[PDB]
Symmetry: D2
Subunit: 322 residues, 4 copies
């Protein structure tokens, strides 16, 4: 075989892992390995997803595994391995930060597997607490700084954009709305940078297409979106938009698209941040994280951002203290 297919390993074959494998089948993006510690269920997802290639009229290989040697040769690795909720807690008390002691353990295990079998892969961490887990994976795996990132802000921005799109009655394709920062209650939806095909939202508000109170409400909804879905589902958390967000990132790498997709990235001076990962606008291409966009935040915005930073910083301190 002179021209081999792209290969993506889904470390974690739950709701998101399986849905991402499905997206690969639909777009014929790459061969898929549905890895997981659970036996049985992954083979079931693998069979379901592979059988879908017939109807999709595409041809990629979807298999399951529980041995890390199976992910060797992966171009991309998307990690969803972990718990979605704390055993016992109610949905009313769902908190991403509480998954720390449970998932760090899992992420470290995965890091060792990747370091050993596919150290040249581009890694996309999904597992929560996202920003903390990406840093955890980076340290444990030893992979280059530009080849590791966490999917979060693309999802947050998707919500931000959809809400605005509904109000303005314009397609979300033409709404540029970005959320940066830690993926949690202190994420920062950049209201001042929201544009309609480049045109500042401020101009649409001055014309009565949206009220300042509605924008504020949309900014709040964006932050609460994840918990809202957790509350409404009853079982687990969001997986459709999250799966597409991660795959969109994977494709940007695979096809060297150079798409601007906000994701938790390694900081070396940007925004005055050092030795940590946090959500920021970035460009993803064949070189991994090729650009970290440094925006000129206002003082008011810097305060909000600093609080968002405190969250990861304390989260990372708790991680170390274990």
């Amino acid at each position: 075989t002179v021209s081999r297919r792209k290969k993506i390993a889904m470390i974690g074959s739950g709701m998101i892992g399986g849905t991402m494998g499905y997206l690969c089948v639909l777009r014929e993006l790459a061969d898929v390995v549905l890895f997981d510690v659970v036996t049985g269920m992954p083979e079931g997802k693998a069979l379901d997803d592979s059988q879908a290639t017939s109807i999709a009229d595409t041809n990629v290989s979807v298999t399951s595994a529980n041995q890390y040697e199976k992910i060797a040769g992966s171009d991309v690795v998307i990690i969803t391995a972990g718990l979605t909720k704390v055993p016992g807690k109610s949905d009313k008390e769902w908190s991403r930060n509480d998954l720390l002691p449970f998932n760090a353990k899992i992420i470290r295990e995965v890091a060792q597997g990747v370091k050993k079998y596919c150290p040249l892969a581009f890694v996309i961490v999904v597992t929560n607490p996202l920003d903390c887990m990406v840093k955890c994976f980076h340290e444990a795996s030893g992979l280059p700084k530009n080849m590791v990132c966490g999917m979060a802000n693309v999802l947050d921005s998707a919500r931000f954009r959809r809400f605005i799109a509904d109000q303005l009655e314009i397609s979300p394709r033409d709404i540029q709305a970005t959320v940066i920062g830690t993926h949690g209650d202190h994420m920062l939806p950049l209201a001042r940078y929201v544009t309609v095909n480049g045109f500042p939202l401020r101009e649409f508000i001055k014309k009565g297409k949206m009220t300042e109170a509605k924008l504020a409400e949309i900014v709040e909804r964006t932050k609460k979106a994840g918990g809202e879905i957790v509350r409404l589902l009853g079982q687990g958390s969001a997986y459709y938009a999250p799966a597409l967000s991660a795959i969109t990132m994977a494709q940007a790498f695979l096809k060297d698209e150079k798409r601007v997709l906000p994701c938790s990235v390694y900081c070396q001076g940007e925004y005055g941040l050092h030795d940590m990962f946090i959500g920021l606008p970035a460009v993803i291409g064949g070189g991994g994280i090729e650009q970290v966009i440094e925006l000129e935040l206002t003082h008011e915005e810097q305060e909000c951002f600093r609080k968002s930073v405190d969250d990861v910083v304390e989260l990372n301190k708790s991680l170390a203290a274990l």
Copy 2:
């Protein structure tokens, strides 16, 4: 002042398959979506998740949830997945689509009243098991035209048949034409004789050593057991990815009048000598609904098998009337 309105598909049942189909509509920007279910909460969680996905897919369709049939009014297509997947008490090995009869007949008749009242002009695709029995139940309970009601099953069965063959021949499933007809159950009939590689009979490939007769037979058996295998491996519910895509592919064939050949459970009126019943047959789906029902020249042997398939639907239909 909208002159050009988007297509609308109501998903009656917002479980694993319903939500996945809504996701598909988002990705292809196929149609606005209504995720209907008797359960409140979950559907809206699905609607939010799927609608938020439009942003990343850069498409624009509306995805909302509902628990009131008035919401499905105007739907161009209705795909029904409402129903149980497994019978409480039964082991995974004991899983049988037929045991679902007394639980889902009730549900399908309710849905029938809802469609009859709010969107009687829709093209209806039943998915709920026992499929062939449920489609017939929906059709008589709803009163919709015979060419506007069908059941999704054989597209899924054929997909498996095709994927298995494709793997063995090292050829894309796009170029494997393998068809399964009959009742969606243990007596479904994978038409081994009609398997082709871009029109070239499989037997020529076998004669040339590409694969053996024994493997063909192994694959035929595997096709029949595919559902239960996944039920066993998942440990919860049943398949939904391929099922959702099968149904949406049929829905799209209708919406865009593609005239695709997609085997599904259809109303019989003389084909293969059958009357007043639904069963899997190769059909052509287009803007006119089920536009053609292909009647294949089956051999006596295949007829023997097909009759066992019919016996099953006939029995189920009897068990239904016996309620």
Copy 3:
């Protein structure tokens, strides 16, 4: 008995752009296609070529040719490319869209009568140059609603603006929002101040050294001269690939009610203080046709430029009445 009919797009003019748009309809299975032209023979050659392509694309739409307006009846959308691309006698360097006025005004008025008679309910997209002048000419000659007629131009101009910026910043054009408004000609206005990278002002990228002001200006000039450069390089006719995609993108926004922001020549009724004329402005295209006309808070400087753009269309419209 077809309940769900495919969309229908009539291509008035089956030259380079018309045929390419039909090709696009085939690939996306967007709609049935009618390749209309006064010339006989060539259009049918295009129809055969494009229809045969459906097989390889595995899609199913109808592509036919015509020379009689009765054939475009029922069209949901009409894209007009009928007209000359260059003036015989003129050198390539002398190429100017304005010189096409006396040759295409005649053609556009004929097409107007055809649409008025056979498919007056269509969403019409004019492409023929001089664009802004031709769209206005079509609108008054046809009598169609003001929200159902527009001209494709600025989407193409913006595409160039975006591609140039994208190359310099090493970012996909998907994430570059660069817009051009005004008359489709040497006085078009690439809005440098409104150029963003996913909403982030370009000036921040310039301030950080990613690219210089001089390059921005070089690109602004390049955007204006793009058409003539291609005319010069091709040596025959003018651009058609990006043009065809620009028009089909607008057509799709209408057909599937996507509500996309696509700058195009639209009917003015007070925006920027303009009345009874068409000119390029950012607009929102959906199922209601031109659903929104965005009026940007232009600075005096940008207003000065925009006024020169308006002066051009006003002059052309005068030259037209003077016929």
Copy 4:
């Protein structure tokens, strides 16, 4: 750049070359190099096609060239370089065989360029007389037998399928109709192998959905399709379906799809043919031509096939005698 984009070189940037570059832009299939001996026009096509990426929201590089070093690193090379008609002749007398003395020269030039700058590419010859030209390119370039093929039968089959699809009122996706043999008047539309999703056409005829006379007519139309389009266009020949046919082949290689796409391939015993290229059913994947399907032709079919073979054989004799 860890993950580089696929690269396709269009040797010949005329109607087909440009249209293929356009398809790459639409599908984001690969970066495109529009090569040609003509200067000016290719840069115009390159600009037009690249500008289309913005509207398509894709990101690939489309450039032009007239120096072979520019095609270095190409994964695929599609050759359309050549004349479409004999200078002076009327459209009434159009014949693919007459382009021989004009295009062999051109194909040999291209062979030297490919051999030198991208010998590891998968080559798809389009230039006519197709079957003769593929053999000409193979001999001159020295590329492996499985990495060189000629696009023709996919186009012929597309016509065959479309005509049948219209009559049966079924999508061409579900019509399997194949044409094999030399791309010319003696091409062989395999009427006995036409199926509707695997179901023999014979069964649809017995049911009155199509008449035997209509099938015969469709078989004739298929052979005459190319000349018909030449007659109707006035300028050149077909390019839309031809461009999609070649790109579909290129994609099958690039993404290792293993699609059954009839194309002129190297024969080593198949159908009793030796040292020549001719249209036959084949599977295209990452290994190039991975399979040559040998069908059990009836005696009647073998006669027709042998005449089709005679055509290339004599064509190849004329090539040698130059």
